[PDB]
Amino acid sequence: PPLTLEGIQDRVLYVLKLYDKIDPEKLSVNSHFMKDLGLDSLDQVEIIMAMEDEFGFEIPDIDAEKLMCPQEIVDYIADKKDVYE
Amino acid sequence: PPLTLEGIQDRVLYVLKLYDKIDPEKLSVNSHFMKDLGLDSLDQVEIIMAMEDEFGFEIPDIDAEKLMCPQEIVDYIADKKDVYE
Amino acid sequence: SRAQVLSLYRAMLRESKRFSAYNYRTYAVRRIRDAFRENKNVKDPVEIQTLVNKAKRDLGVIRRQVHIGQLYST
Amino acid sequence: SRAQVLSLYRAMLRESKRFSAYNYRTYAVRRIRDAFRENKNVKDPVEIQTLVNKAKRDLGVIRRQVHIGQLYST
Numbered sequence A, B: 001p002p003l004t005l006e007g008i009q010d011r012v013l014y015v016l017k018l019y020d021k022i023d024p025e026k027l028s029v030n031s032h033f034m035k036d037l038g039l040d041s042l043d044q045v046e047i048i049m050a051m052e053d054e055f056g057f058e059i060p061d062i063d064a065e066k067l068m069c070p071q072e073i074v075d076y077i078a079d080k081k082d083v084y085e
Numbered sequence C, D: 001s002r003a004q005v006l007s008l009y010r011a012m013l014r015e016s017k018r019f020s021a022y023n024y025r026t027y028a029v030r031r032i033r034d035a036f037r038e039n040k041n042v043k044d045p046v047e048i049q050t051l052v053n054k055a056k057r058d059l060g061v062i063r064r065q066v067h068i069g070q071l072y073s074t
Ligand SMILES: *P(=O)(O)OCC(C)(C)[C@@H](O)C(=O)NCCC(=O)NCCSC(=O)CCCCCCCCCCC
Pocket: A040, A041, A042, D001, D002, D005, D006, D027, D028, D031, D032, D035, D036, D037, D039, D040, D041, D042, D043, D048, D051, D052, D054, D055, D058, D062
């Protein structure tokens, strides 16, 4: 089934709900991985690699290092897969 | 120098002004390669390959086959190189 | 079919770019363009399939020549 | 520097994924994660360079092991 913004956001958050270092009750679509969820940049590398696995494509280093909340990930996936609704 | 929408459009049109089959006086940013410029789909394959050379990256077949006027090419390049102004 | 012809056209032109000598890149491109265009207005469907099979075959020839050229390189 | 450490961290985890056996993928990932984390709060700059050089070297070890595994594959 073709990707939608709703499906992208649901799957991004699903991946994060399986990352065991995140407190489930602080996770929101605008939770900053560092300032809000208490993660570090080693965790962030792993999280973006998990997004690559979920959506089936690689994210260049320069792009991956900028994605620090779920909404930024959603926006990026939607862009790179050309999803508009 | 970082890419801009103005630079993208100027270079797209430049590539087309060097394609010798196009009548210079019909070429505009919204000229349809087939309906307006009298080209065919063999020409169109070559034109998009020339855009790949100009901008330094490959365009998948499914994407390339849809680009049938300069503005569509400009919009695509800007998207794929993440250019917003 | 139209899609198959245009896919092979693009693939052959892509492989042509991989020749190291300018003269041979231009030779391959010219041959490809003339060969596809001179059959543009063929109508006989079986004749189309025959020409498609030739493109499939010559795409293999081009790829093998590219590889051999890489072996003779420096 | 921070950027170099994180680039090597990602590169090593990427290579780890290329092992064919599940158990060895998980072994490599666990070793990488523990090795980088257990040095997170090192401050001595020369000690940092030493650890960076180890990562550079072990990235080579990982790549060679991946290649040898591919040769023993079916
Ligand atoms: P992020 O929170 O913004 O930044 C995280 C880092 C670690 C970059 C940051 O906290 C930092 O700069 N810390 C300072 C100290 C430092 O850089 N520590 C890391 C040094 S690099 C290192 O320890 C690599 C060790 C290599 C071991 C590899 C083992 C591989 C095993 C292979 C099995 C097959």
